[PDB]
C-alpha cells in the first residue's frame, strides 16, 4: 500500500536525468560559443 | 486526497517526452546514415 519507495525511486531517476539534461545544455552552449571563436 | 488527475498529467507529459525522444533517436540514426551516403 505505501508506495513511497517506488515514488522516491522515480524522483532519484528523474532528478539524475535532469542533472544530465542541464549538463548537456551547458556543454551545447559552450560548444556553440567555441565555434564562434574558432571561426 | 485522490491525486489521479495529477499522476495522469505526469503520464501524459512523460509519454509526450518519450515520443519526442524516440523521434529524435530515429532522426539521429537517419542523419548518421545519410552522411555515410554523402561521404
Amino acid at each position: 500500500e505505501d508506495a513511497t519507495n517506488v515514488v522516491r525511486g522515480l524522483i532519484v531517476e528523474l532528478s539524475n536525468l535532469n542533472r544530465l539534461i542541464m549538463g548537456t545544455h551547458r556543454d551545447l552552449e559552450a560548444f556553440k560559443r567555441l565555434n564562434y571563436r574558432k571561426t | 486526497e485522490d491525486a489521479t488527475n495529477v499522476v495522469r498529467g505526469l503520464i501524459v507529459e512523460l509519454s509526450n517526452l518519450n515520443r519526442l525522444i524516440m523521434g529524435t533517436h530515429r532522426d539521429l540514426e537517419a542523419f548518421k546514415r545519410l552522411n555515410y551516403r554523402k561521404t
Binding site: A3, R8 | V7, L14, L17, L20
Partner: peptide, 30 residues
Amino acid sequence: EFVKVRKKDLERLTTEVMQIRDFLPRILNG
C-alpha cells in the same frame, strides 16, 4: 486498487517532470 503516496513526494516528482518538460525539447529539437 489504490496505493498511498506522500503529497510532498508527489509535488517533488511533479517538479522533476516539469523541469524535463521545460528543458529537454530545446535540446532535442536543435
